[PDB]
Design a protein around this motif. Structure first.
Motif, PDB file in Angstrom:
ATOM      1  N   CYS A  99       0.836  -1.192   0.000  1.00 42.26           N
ATOM      2  CA  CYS A  99       0.000   0.000   0.000  1.00 42.26           C
ATOM      3  C   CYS A  99       0.875   1.247   0.000  1.00 42.26           C
ATOM      4  O   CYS A  99       1.859   1.330   0.735  1.00 42.26           O
ATOM      5  N   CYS A 102      -0.401   3.603   3.675  1.00 40.20           N
ATOM      6  CA  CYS A 102       0.307   2.985   4.785  1.00 40.20           C
ATOM      7  C   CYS A 102       1.289   1.966   4.230  1.00 40.20           C
ATOM      8  O   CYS A 102       1.033   1.328   3.209  1.00 40.20           O
ATOM      9  N   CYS A 110      -2.387  -4.148   5.756  1.00 39.72           N
ATOM     10  CA  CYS A 110      -3.071  -2.928   5.343  1.00 39.72           C
ATOM     11  C   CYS A 110      -4.541  -2.978   5.736  1.00 39.72           C
ATOM     12  O   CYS A 110      -5.225  -3.977   5.499  1.00 39.72           O
ATOM     13  N   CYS A 112      -6.519   0.063   5.159  1.00 40.25           N
ATOM     14  CA  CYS A 112      -7.023   1.324   4.633  1.00 40.25           C
ATOM     15  C   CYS A 112      -8.360   1.168   3.927  1.00 40.25           C
ATOM     16  O   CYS A 112      -9.038   2.170   3.681  1.00 40.25           O
TER      17      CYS A 112
END
Ligand SMILES: C[S@@+](CC[C@H](N)C(=O)[O-])C[C@H]1O[C@@H](n2cnc3c(N)ncnc32)[C@H](O)[C@@H]1O
Ligand SMILES: [Zn+2]
Ligand SMILES: [Zn+2]
Lengths: 115, 298
Positions: A99, A102, A110, A112
């Motif tokens: 990602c 992040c 991850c 997100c």
């Protein structure tokens, strides 16, 4: 024409082939940030940290890194690998994506894409 | 002893002061092995304990520190020691490594070829050597001082090591050199350090701490190697992986040690004192340029 080595390694694995060995696993606290590619080992309780060069298929196979300019994301860095996949770090780094928001692996840290 | 919880054992000073004759090395723990953590290569553990020991010495750690690593490749095609050194040295440290045979590295630059072909413009703050030629372990012939890459190393230290810099050079019972032992007397301190993971081997790292550019004490290399072998013959070291499990304080502290470009007349006793304490590096701070000589033929 261009040799497509990532594909060939994926098919080699699918054919029941032995993964690339001698990836350099580091000693660390395993209390790190768990991000994917870091400047020092950042494994958490669930990861192992490897030296990046030993985990890059192109570096390990002595072939061109696939991009203009030929730069390598892993060499000189450290790559965190989930312990359930540490048998095959090269295959893991090939099969997965980091990602860009992040620093974590998509699907392996991850979050997100959460509510 | 607390020794099993240390990264290794350093040669005690009283042994350095003896005058033993060279004897065949016969270790009581020969053939024993340390229980390495799961999946860890021996050389990662070995370099780790080497760096843990180095953390106890007065190393100068400048900004844009310059570290060169000889003997960095392996028969695996990778460089485990270079990865440990990378993890240990502060971010931004320039790490150049080299080996005779090709390997893939995490160093900032890698030169392939005999170390005798390696030339650099700049000087270095830390030299690490794991160069080893297995053909030297010949128990059927006399154990003479060896030349080869050791010669290069001595030259490389006297010409390209910054004042206040430090070295760690791998030796064994048969892979050793008398001029290197002598050169240890040109440092503020020196030792032979044995890792606890490889304590069943005659291997040690000759560590010169804080280079002074001139002899501080006079050391006979033949006698001193005899002293090291006597130490290892009479002090069985207990194999241990313990120190590998506490990596919480492993990174080398970035001390920002001062770097000054002084000429030789300027090196008074106060400068020598600063060099001895790990508080000063003397070298030019130009660009780092390296090369490997290539012999052309048909
Ligand atoms: C014990 S191996 C080093 C292993 C490595 N340090 C690691 O992390 O695994 C010794 C290395 O020294 C190298 N070597 C021996 N003589 C050399 C020479 N004269 N010039 C350059 N390399 C040399 C060998 O190629 C070998 O790779
Ligand atoms: Zn690569
Ligand atoms: Zn994300």
């Amino acid at each position: 024409f261009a040799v497509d080595a990532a594909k060939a390694y994926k098919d080699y694995l699918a054919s029941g082939g032995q993964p690339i060995t001698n990836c350099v696993k580091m000693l660390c606290t395993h209390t790190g940030t768990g991000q994917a590619i870091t400047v020092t080992p950042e494994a958490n309780m669930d990861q192992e940290s490897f030296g990046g060069a030993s985990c890059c298929l192109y570096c390990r196979c002595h072939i061109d890194h696939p991009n203009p300019k030929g730069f390598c994301d892993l060499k000189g860095k450290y790559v965190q690998i989930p312990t359930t996949c540490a048998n095959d770090p090269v295959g893991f780094t090939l099969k997965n994506t980091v990602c860009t928001v992040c620093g974590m692996w998509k699907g392996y840290g991850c979050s997100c894409d959460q509510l | 002893s607390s020794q099993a919880w240390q990264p290794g054992v350093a040669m005690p000073n009283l042994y350095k002061m003896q005058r033993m004759l060279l004897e065949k090395c016969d270790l009581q723990n020969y053939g024993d092995s340390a229980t390495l953590p799961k999946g860890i290569m021996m050389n990662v553990a070995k370099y780790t304990q080497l760096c843990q020991y180095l953390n106890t010495l007065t190393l100068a750690v400048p900004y844009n520190m310059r570290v060169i690593h000889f003997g960095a490749g392996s028969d695996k095609g990778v460089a485990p020691g270079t990865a440990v050194l990378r993890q240990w040295l502060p971010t931004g440290t320039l790490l150049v490594d080299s080996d005779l045979n090709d390997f893939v590295s995490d160093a900032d630059s890698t030169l392939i070829g005999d170390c005798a072909t390696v030339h650099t413009a700049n000087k270095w703050d830390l030299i690490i050597s794991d160069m080893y030629d297995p053909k030297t372990k010949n128990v059927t012939k006399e154990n003479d001082s060896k030349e080869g890459f050791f010669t290069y190393i001595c030259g490389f230290i006297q010409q390209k090591l910054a004042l206040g810099g430090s070295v760690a050079i791998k030796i064994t019972e048969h892979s050793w050199n008398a001029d290197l032992y002598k050169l240890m007397g040109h440092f503020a301190w020196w030792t032979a350090f044995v890792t606890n993971v490889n304590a069943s081997s005659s291997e040690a790292f000759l560590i010169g701490c804080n280079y002074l550019g001139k002899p501080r004490e006079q050391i006979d290399g033949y006698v001193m190697h005899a002293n090291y072998i006597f130490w290892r013959n009479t002090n069985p070291i207990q194999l241990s992986s313990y120190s590998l499990f506490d990596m919480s304080k492993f990174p080398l502290k970035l001390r920002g040690t001062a770097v000054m470009s002084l000429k030789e007349g300027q090196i008074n006793d106060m400068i020598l004192s600063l060099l001895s304490k790990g508080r000063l590096i003397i070298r030019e701070n130009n660009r780092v340029v390296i090369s490997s000589d290539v012999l052309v033929n048909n």
